[PDB]
Amino acid sequence: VKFGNDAGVKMLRGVNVLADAVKVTLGPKGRNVVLDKSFGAPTITKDGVSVAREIELEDKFENMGAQMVKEVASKANDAAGDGTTTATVLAQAIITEGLKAVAAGMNPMDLKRGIDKAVTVAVEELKALSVPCSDSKAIAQVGTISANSDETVGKLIAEAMDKVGKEGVITVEDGTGLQDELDVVEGMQFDRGYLSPYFINKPETGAVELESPFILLADKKISNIREMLPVLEAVAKAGKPLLIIAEDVEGEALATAVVNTMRGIVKVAAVKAPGFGDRRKAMLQDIATLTGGTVISEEIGMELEKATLEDLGQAKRVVINKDTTTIIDGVGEEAAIQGRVAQIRQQIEEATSDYDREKLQERVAKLAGGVAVIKVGAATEVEMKEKKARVEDALHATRAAVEEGVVAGGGVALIRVASKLADLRGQNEDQNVGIKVALRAMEAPLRQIVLNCGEEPSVVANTVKGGDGNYGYNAATEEYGNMIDMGILDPTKVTRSALQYAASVAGLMITTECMVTD
Amino acid sequence: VKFGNDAGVKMLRGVNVLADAVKVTLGPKGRNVVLDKSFGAPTITKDGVSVAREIELEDKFENMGAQMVKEVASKANDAAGDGTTTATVLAQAIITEGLKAVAAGMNPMDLKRGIDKAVTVAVEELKALSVPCSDSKAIAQVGTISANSDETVGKLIAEAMDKVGKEGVITVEDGTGLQDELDVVEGMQFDRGYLSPYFINKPETGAVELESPFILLADKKISNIREMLPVLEAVAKAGKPLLIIAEDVEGEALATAVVNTMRGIVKVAAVKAPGFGDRRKAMLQDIATLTGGTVISEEIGMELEKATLEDLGQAKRVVINKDTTTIIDGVGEEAAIQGRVAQIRQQIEEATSDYDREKLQERVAKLAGGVAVIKVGAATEVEMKEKKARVEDALHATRAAVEEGVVAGGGVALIRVASKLADLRGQNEDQNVGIKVALRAMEAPLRQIVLNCGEEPSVVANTVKGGDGNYGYNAATEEYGNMIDMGILDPTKVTRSALQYAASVAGLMITTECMVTD
Amino acid sequence: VKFGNDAGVKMLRGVNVLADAVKVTLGPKGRNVVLDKSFGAPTITKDGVSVAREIELEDKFENMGAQMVKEVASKANDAAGDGTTTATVLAQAIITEGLKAVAAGMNPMDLKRGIDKAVTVAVEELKALSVPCSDSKAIAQVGTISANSDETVGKLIAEAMDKVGKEGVITVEDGTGLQDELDVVEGMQFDRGYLSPYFINKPETGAVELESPFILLADKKISNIREMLPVLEAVAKAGKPLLIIAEDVEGEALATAVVNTMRGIVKVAAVKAPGFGDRRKAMLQDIATLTGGTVISEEIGMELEKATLEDLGQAKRVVINKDTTTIIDGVGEEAAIQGRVAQIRQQIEEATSDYDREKLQERVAKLAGGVAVIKVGAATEVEMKEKKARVEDALHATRAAVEEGVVAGGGVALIRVASKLADLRGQNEDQNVGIKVALRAMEAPLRQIVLNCGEEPSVVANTVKGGDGNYGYNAATEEYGNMIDMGILDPTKVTRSALQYAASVAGLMITTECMVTD
Amino acid sequence: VAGGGVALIRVASKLADLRGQNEDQNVGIKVALRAMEAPLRQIVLNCGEEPSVVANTVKGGDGNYGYNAATEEYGNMIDMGILDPTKVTRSALQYAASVAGLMITTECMVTD
Numbered sequence A, B, C: 001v002k003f004g005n006d007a008g009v010k011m012l013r014g015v016n017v018l019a020d021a022v023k024v025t026l027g028p029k030g031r032n033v034v035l036d037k038s039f040g041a042p043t044i045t046k047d048g049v050s051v052a053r054e055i056e057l058e059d060k061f062e063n064m065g066a067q068m069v070k071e072v073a074s075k076a077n078d079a080a081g082d083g084t085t086t087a088t089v090l091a092q093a094i095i096t097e098g099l100k101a102v103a104a105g106m107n108p109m110d111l112k113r114g115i116d117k118a119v120t121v122a123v124e125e126l127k128a129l130s131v132p133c134s135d136s137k138a139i140a141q142v143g144t145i146s147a148n149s150d151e152t153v154g155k156l157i158a159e160a161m162d163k164v165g166k167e168g169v170i171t172v173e174d175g176t177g178l179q180d181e182l183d184v185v186e187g188m189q190f191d192r193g194y195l196s197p198y199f200i201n202k203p204e205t206g207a208v209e210l211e212s213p214f215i216l217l218a219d220k221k222i223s224n225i226r227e228m229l230p231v232l233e234a235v236a237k238a239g240k241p242l243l244i245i246a247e248d249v250e251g252e253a254l255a256t257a258v259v260n261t262m263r264g265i266v267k268v269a270a271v272k273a274p275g276f277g278d279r280r281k282a283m284l285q286d287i288a289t290l291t292g293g294t295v296i297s298e299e300i301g302m303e304l305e306k307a308t309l310e311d312l313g314q315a316k317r318v319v320i321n322k323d324t325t326t327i328i329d330g331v332g333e334e335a336a337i338q339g340r341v342a343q344i345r346q347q348i349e350e351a352t353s354d355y356d357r358e359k360l361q362e363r364v365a366k367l368a369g370g371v372a373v374i375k376v377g378a379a380t381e382v383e384m385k386e387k388k389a390r391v392e393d394a395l396h397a398t399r400a401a402v403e404e405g406v407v408a409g410g411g412v413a414l415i416r417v418a419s420k421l422a423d424l425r426g427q428n429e430d431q432n433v434g435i436k437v438a439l440r441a442m443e444a445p446l447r448q449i450v451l452n453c454g455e456e457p458s459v460v461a462n463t464v465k466g467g468d469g470n471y472g473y474n475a476a477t478e479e480y481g482n483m484i485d486m487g488i489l490d491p492t493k494v495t496r497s498a499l500q501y502a503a504s505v506a507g508l509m510i511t512t513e514c515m516v517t518d
Numbered sequence D: 001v002a003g004g005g006v007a008l009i010r011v012a013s014k015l016a017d018l019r020g021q022n023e024d025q026n027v028g029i030k031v032a033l034r035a036m037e038a039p040l041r042q043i044v045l046n047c048g049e050e051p052s053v054v055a056n057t058v059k060g061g062d063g064n065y066g067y068n069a070a071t072e073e074y075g076n077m078i079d080m081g082i083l084d085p086t087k088v089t090r091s092a093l094q095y096a097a098s099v100a101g102l103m104i105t106t107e108c109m110v111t112d
Helices: A005-025 A048-053 A060-072 A073-082 A084-104 A108-129 A135-145 A151-164 A277-289 A332-349 A356-362 A380-403 A412-417 A429-441 A444-453 A458-464 A490-512 B005-025 B049-054 B058-074 B072-082 B084-104 B108-128 B134-144 B151-164 B279-291 B334-349 B356-362 B382-404 B410-418 B428-443 B444-453 B457-465 B494-508 C005-025 C048-053 C058-071 C074-080 C082-106 C107-129 C136-146 C149-164 C276-290 C334-347 C358-361 C381-404 C412-417 C429-441 C442-451 C455-466 C492-510 D006-011 D023-035 D038-047 D050-057 D086-104
Strands: A034-035 A041-045 A170-171 A180-184 A215-218 A242-245 A371-375 A404-410 A472-474 A481-482 A488-493 B033-035 B044-046 B169-173 B182-186 B215-218 B243-246 B371-377 B404-408 B473-474 B481-482 B489-491 B511-515 C033-035 C041-044 C169-174 C181-185 C216-217 C243-246 C371-375 C406-408 C472-473 C478-483 C490-491 D066-067 D075-077
Touching: A005 A034, A005 A048, A005 A060, A005 A084, A005 B511, A005 C243, A034 A048, A034 A242, A034 B058, A034 B494, A034 C472, A041 A048, A041 A380, A048 A084, A060 A073, A060 A084, A060 A180, A060 A490, A073 A084, A073 A490, A084 A108, A084 A429, A084 A444, A084 A490, A084 C082, A108 A404, A108 A429, A108 A490, A108 B410, A135 A151, A135 A277, A151 A170, A151 A180, A151 A371, A151 A380, A170 A380, A180 B058, A215 A277, A277 A332, A332 A356, A332 B005, A371 B489, A380 A488, A380 A490, A404 B444, A404 C490, A412 A444, A412 A458, A412 A472, A412 A490, A429 A490, A429 C429, A444 A458, A444 A472, A458 D050, A488 A490, A488 C149, A490 C033, A490 D023, B005 B033, B005 B058, B005 B084, B005 B511, B033 B049, B044 B049, B044 C442, B049 B084, B058 B072, B058 B084, B058 B494, B058 B511, B072 B084, B072 B494, B084 B108, B084 B444, B108 B404, B108 B410, B108 B494, B134 B151, B134 B382, B151 B169, B151 B182, B151 B382, B169 B382, B215 B279, B215 B371, B279 B334, B279 B410, B334 B356, B382 B494, B404 B410, B404 B494, B404 C243, B410 B444, B410 B457, B410 B494, B428 B494, B444 C371, B444 C412, B457 B473, B494 B511, C005 C033, C005 C048, C005 C058, C005 C082, C033 C048, C041 C048, C041 C074, C048 C082, C058 C074, C058 C082, C074 C082, C074 C492, C082 C107, C082 C442, C082 C492, C107 C406, C107 C429, C136 C381, C149 C169, C149 C181, C149 C371, C149 C381, C149 C442, C169 C381, C216 C276, C276 C334, C334 C358, C381 C490, C381 C492, C412 C442, C412 C455, C412 C472, C412 C492, C429 C492, C442 C455, C442 C472, C455 C472, C490 C492, D006 D038, D006 D050, D006 D066, D006 D086, D023 D086, D038 D050, D050 D066
Parallel strands: A034 B511, A170 A371, A215 A242, B169 B371, B215 B243, C169 C371, C216 C243
Antiparallel strands: A034 A041, A180 A371, A404 A488, A472 A481, B033 B044, B182 B371, B404 B489, B473 B481, C033 C041, C181 C371, C406 C490, C472 C478, D066 D075
16 A cells, blocks of 8 residues: 555656666667567567566556556557557656656646646647548558558558458458469458457467357357357367357356366357347347358247257358457358348338437448458468568558548657647646646657657757648658658557557546555 | 666676687687586587587576577578577677677667678678589588598588589488498478477487388368377387378477377477468478378368378488478389479479479479488498588588588688778768678687687787788698688688678667566 | 755755744744753743754755755844744745745746746735834834833833934833933944954843943954054953944954953954945044044054054943944034034035935934933833833834834735735746745745644635735634734734745755755 | 857867868767867756757857857847857867866876
């Protein structure tokens, strides 16, 4: 049990540890981090996440103060695809200068209230700075860059995206031959994480990517185983796977056982049904009709469961993880799966009025949309593997950018908008000195970036600062040019959910008064 | 968690340990190292690798800083056949004087950038200094020397190499009688390492050299166981082984268981299939036709696986290890194995155009090439064993030299080319003081070598330095003559992959900023 | 040698000691302080100065940080008559909350700049709140109260003050009989302190109050021784014373020687002559003509020286001290001393123009004004001594009040004006948070006062705060009435030089960066 | 010469491409140049503004143009009356490098 500042000196002591190590890889002249390992031969890396994943301090209080910056900043990548490292640098910036005021007496509730305001505005701003991304050429412009400028890749993402829309379930399946294959195949995909972390097939990633399973549906949930057982046985026979997808399976027994148981055997895956009430039920008979169903076992009354057985559904692959779950290849006689969509289509006709067409339009899109599977290609498995990596990566980036657009990268957007908010106020004083915290906070990424470069950070941040638009310092060549034009960018989503999470934790920490540990 | 220089004083403290002990055996007046052992009676050795294999320090940070120089410098021998010790001396040289600048403020990214440039050039240079090695007399000149000048041995390597080409799968099988036997026999050989380290039959080496096995193939992967178982048963019956050779077998269951388971018983091996897609598939039915196959089981649708058973393939011996895997004696009715090659031969005819003839020329070479087995000979098993050792050794050297040639040994090439680069520059200053690091770095091996001799190292390195060509100081007699003419040399590959790996680790270490350990 | 905050935690640690002990006597329910002494039997006191005089801490840095608040707050009483304790409470308030900002990053120069502004205004304010004090009844109203409401005393101060003006040299000579005597006698008085602290006859015071001396003057011064021686021787013768009054004798030788030487023886014174150039010279021949002079030997040319022676001047008494020196009874044949004034009077006539009449009007006022000696009276020497004490005291108070008037006491003026400055700003932000410091600083005396009472300080300071005029909380009876009407007051000079010195030290401390000690 | 610590950072920019007998000597030359930027960077630091931005600005603008820290404005330092004799700026640089010479080439220290 520790109170007030004495709690704060601990959260900070360990925040700087977490932040100082991961921020070290930030920038095009990012540095290496040597991470020892259980079975000899340290991994010399440069990936922000990986480094933080390995950060637990000896002190309880500091471990607490750091494990917080780690679960929230985690939610950055998780939703945007990127942002963990940046979220750790920004969380570090707000907490540091934010806690310093707290100690001078400023109302923590007010410091946070202002710290929260400059954000709602900043977001409004970087959204104004964004350059949309609709056209095939757009998706392509952004695709290539993320592929480190592999002209090919953009071209794939534009086809995938075209074959089944900008907001579709595109997949990155590894290769079989040289060429490079692409094909729109039967599938579903939804927001339901694996019931256990360990489910990782294995892967881890973080995905239970199972090959040829049996999806069981049951309404518910589942738881245980026995019853359932048977379934397983169946698955065983062979186929183986096994797959359990039922109501909160739971576981007790179954888951746890389954887871543990587982380892061995078977594978397984589961997973759970999506939504609830009649919703999760129908979607289960949908997923059912998709994967072969029969089953709904559971359913319721009717129932169935165982018774129816055995029955079930099959599917070629599933790729679960916390947050999502992708049914890659249905087996339901297409036509059958067709009559489902059409049935709903008609239902809409008899869907009276008020909103139920939303779900009746949203739930047909999954059946009547399918997956769009990409089969990367090359010559050597070696050469084949890096491309897969590259693609899988870039596809994520494009889905991000497609939504909220693309802001000036290199850490320019944040220091571009936080200058437009130079004369922003709140309910009172403490709140303005809170607002002023978050602005100087947003200058954190660049100053780091340029620091890894070796040039002095107050001169670039000073220059980049006073020159409206996406004008910035391309640290990759160390030249002050139009950042978007020089192709040095990143989606708006990531720069947003970077700033959004940085100030979330930081809010919770400044207004914390007591810490209980063993 | 340690940062900056405080991380550097640790990596260095333990690099010097690793380097100082192994570099002690360097030179024709190399010294002994007494290595204690688990079950009494210390091994008094003089082999660079063996000594380093036994180097782990009490301090975590230093252990990290040393285990790095050990996994990369490992890749020297691994690819070139030699270079570990030299890579440890050179890695020590670059890291030492490279880190010293870092501390004076020089941009690490730039120190490394220059440190990387003087290399791309040096390689261009020692490749110009090389004396090719095609003719039987050549292979012989180099063969003998590596056999410590056993006129016989060269003569074997030239026959082996002639019987099935300079780039063929030659083998060093132990003897049966006095004479000395040689015979081109049915076989394959490829770049696929054993799925587990422990696979070492046982051886170780580091090779699972199995006698009379059954190779199972399967597409795938595988894973577981149961379914497967048966196968184983067968193987047982016886044969035984058992042998599993399938897609990433894974483982859961198967592987682981197977591985553990284984031881016891048976053996097984595995091991895994080579390449991917239709590639790994065909090669599996090839290897199949080679070893008897039938199998592809797995395959786817167809497937087978277982148924166828049981079926399988047989083979007299396999000699797996990380990186490679040698099928020494097929059993497929030769003629059958013949119709395979011819089939592919014809396929090429219907192979449209664009590159697929490459693999269709590369994949026939393995079937239609066979192994070339050498049966060393002598009188006493004692006398018989040393020759085997000697040969097995020299055959490696010749395969090396055959490719990139043979540069002046005795540590002359490196100090011969790094003098031609006396007026080499980069993007900026820090980069030149980085370039100057790598040049004085390349004078490391000799200065050591001569030091073990007992004469002063600044006088020989000064002399050898200012006298173009392969002129050097033959430390074996301590006379300054034409090093290539005095027969004191080593392949270009090894001197290259010695310098290439020395600066790889050293790059990663200078630009490292944080170290995380328990 | 200590830097920054580490210097600040020390100045503060010892400021709180000094302040916390003396502020303990503040209020009509002030507490006792037990001060041990060299020769047994601790003095149980309640006088702010006396307590502080005995405050030196074990730590050098803190002793420094406290000895500062002691020499400046000393200048309060010294010029106003009162203010040391208040100056210590206020200096404590500004330094405490002033240093806290410094640590949060606020510009110290700016914190002080605002901290200095709210003062220039406050003074403007409490000067508006003052009720003048001219009439005999006024001087009387204020005289009595300071005599703890001894109706007699006021009546004396009004006579003294009338006999030779509000700004005259009144003296508090001890008694001879019962009655009570008063008489305007030959004298001078001026701003020249004793050349050595030790000069203290024884016373111490701190006054060398000599009985029947010889004042020597020589130009112147013185130285040585020788030459011267013678013267011585013368013275021786016786016257023785022996008395030396020459140019910086121374011483070588013378012174030383013377011273040483012374012781033983014678016485011586011285003491020294006043002013300079022809000024100090003339005044010496004046003082000369006053005390008998003859001498100026021384013167121248012329021258013278021685031458012238043997000759000299005589005088009944002198009362020297740092800052002043009072010639109580001349001996120059009055008429002689008359012809001096008249001579100057005429000189003015031939005094051309431009300012020299100022001194010619100011220097005749001392000769042609004389002293106004008060001979306190009673029955028992005991009863006689306390009155002397009481008078000597009250006479000081009246001379204070006569000048800048009388503000609402009880700590109301400060919290009355610092509320009128609720919407006062400066060059920037840091300066306003500096201004806000000094305002909440001015609420320090009362909150203490009421605290000694035992009632809660945020409720009275809250009430007294929101009710314009001299309305306050008469803590002597704990009732909220018109403070001036309830007779609970104190001169404007003291409340001013309390606030003026509190922020002087506090300015110097906030902008201090280094402390050097042994 | 231009005061405010401008002269030193004004001339040490004109010597940006100055060399000697060898390398070590240039990295010695480069020491003394970045050395001459010491007074200002301090001065501005006491002010509270960032020292790499003013030294960067004052640096790239020929003449007695500088940053009058007394009002924090970048104007002609001699014209703004913020100066100091050449003798002092000279014997400041002359003595700074005298001791510094003696210390760098010192190898042993004997004391009680």
